[model samples]
Target: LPAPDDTGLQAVLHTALSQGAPGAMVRVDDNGTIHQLSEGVADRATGRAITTTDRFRVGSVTKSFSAVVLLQLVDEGKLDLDASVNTYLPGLLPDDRITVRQVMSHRSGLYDYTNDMFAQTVPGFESVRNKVFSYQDLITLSLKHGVTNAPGAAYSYSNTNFVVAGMLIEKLTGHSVATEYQNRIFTPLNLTDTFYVHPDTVIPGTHANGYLTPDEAGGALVDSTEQTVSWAQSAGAVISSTQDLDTFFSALMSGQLMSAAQLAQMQQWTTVNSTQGYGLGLRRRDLSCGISVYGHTGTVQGYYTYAFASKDGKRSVTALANTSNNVNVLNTMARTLESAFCGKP
Candidate 1:
């Protein structure tokens, strides 16, 4: 592997700061030799600097965790990837053609309720930030709209899909998602900084406060630090630090989390865009230097996260900016992937 371009990584964080993030940080674990870098402040008012150790909401990166738990069930023959979702949760979905694999891979075509839930940003967020909804409630919201594509037809990301995965986990194991995640992945991997706290607004430790940018230009930033995040529970409610994320993805990419067959299943790619592919709940990003890294990106109200690891799992990174809803920051933060995986461009 090429030496990590530390200068390029720092430049990316500086770009994120220039793009209006209060702060940004990244933790890169290259075969145990580590690099922790940060820029700007974790909290705007206090001017507290950001650190790699601080916990933050990971948003959709939680999808990978949910996917791993379900894949483990598949490995145990407790679940079938090709089985229709309706087979497990009878009548849960309006259509019977959507299978577990489709849902996991975003080919299920289930409408993404978040498009409407967060359509107006600040007002939309304020309305539901504290509200709690059951998994079925979220599914119902999606069902209100027609499916985007036929099952197995194309890739269309829908948070509703993972919510269904959550429902499957609970129905299959007779346990809550929090318990299953802890018993299955967290405890086993010893990810001390990772947590799933739904319906509870607190981060539970020293952490950065996320600032949600308003939709209107020059508008004030909302301190979106605390809320149930119920709208994105199973799909995006995970809170993790950079260090724990690196460890988690490293283990995952290394085949330590699941069987090789299951890991292979998780890497079955469906083209998402020019440089990325969606495989089950995992994302494969083709970097500038021709290296492909596997992991996921997250976008919550006030946080943008990129967590990825090399194919061998020997190298991993978790980069975060404690502010979101700004296009400049979002695009700039994405460059960290290239800097870490592809070296200096």
Candidate 2:
């Protein structure tokens, strides 16, 4: 495997930073070799240089982690994939029509309360920036909006699904989501830098300061986005570094974490779009080279992330930008990383 060198990698980082992330970091691993690249400032106010070690909020990628734990339980015969969530989590979802598979595949038909919750962006974020929400409360909020589709009928991404999944994990394991994450995924992969911080805990040590794009007609807001991630909880609140993300995703696809049957079940496509499709907790994207990569994308307040790998698990790439709402920039970064991993078109 070639070291990530300046061969089109640095240029990609440069474009991402120039487009608006205060800073950006990327890590690529192929076979047993590794390469890292960083650009821009992690903390624009302090001008701290971006590094491979800096932790960033991984957003919805937490769903993938949560899904792994739940699937592990299924593998152990501790849970049922098609069983109603009420089987494991009673008095959780308002309706008994939803199943564990629906929640994992985004077919739970649960509405995304965050759509209304964050409709106003900055102000909405400010309202909940310091507020701690119970997983039940979050699911309740979605319940108030009603289901979007019949359970298992179609795919509709909703944070409520994973929030319920997290609750189910706790219910079965009799432990906090953090404990399950550590025992199931983190410890097994030796991802010492990764952590699941819920309930407004700030990321310790040096980390990127997330900058949110304000809806107002002025400059994008630097939210410092340190706390209030509790709003995402089991759905999207994990903090990790690009290096750890690379490790986690690589290990996941390499079958180091799940049985072949379970992995196949998790990777099966349930819905598709111009860019990708939903598959349990995973996302499948058809790279320009016609090689499909399996992984997940994360969006939380001030952070945007992409972590994916080839089907063979021989190559993996993870990228993060310290700003959200720059979809174009994020797409470009993803495209470049895909090119790097798949090689020249």
The most accurate candidate by lDDT is 1
lDDT per residue, candidate 2, 171-221, as tens digits? 899999999999999998888889987775688678888998676545756
| Segments of candidate 2 deviating more than 4 angstroms | 1-6, 217-220
**Residue 6 shift from truth in candidate 1, angstroms:** 0.9
Q: Write candidate 1's Cα lDDT for 1-345 as tens digits.
A: 788889989999998998889999998998989988998888999999899998999999999999999999999999999999999999988889899999999999999999998889999899999899999999999999999888999999999999998999999999999999999999999989889989999997989899999999989889999999899888999999999999999999999989999999999999999999999899999987889999999998899999999998999999999999998999898888888877865
TM for every model, in the order presented, reads 0.99, 0.95
- Cα-based RMSD of candidate 1: 0.8
What candidate 1 gets wrong by more than 4 Å, as runs, is none
Cα-based lDDT at residue 60, candidate 2: 93
lDDT of 1: 0.93
Q: Give the top-scoring candidate (TM-score).
A: 1
Clashing pairs in 2: none
Cα lDDT computed for each candidate against the true fold: 0.93, 0.82
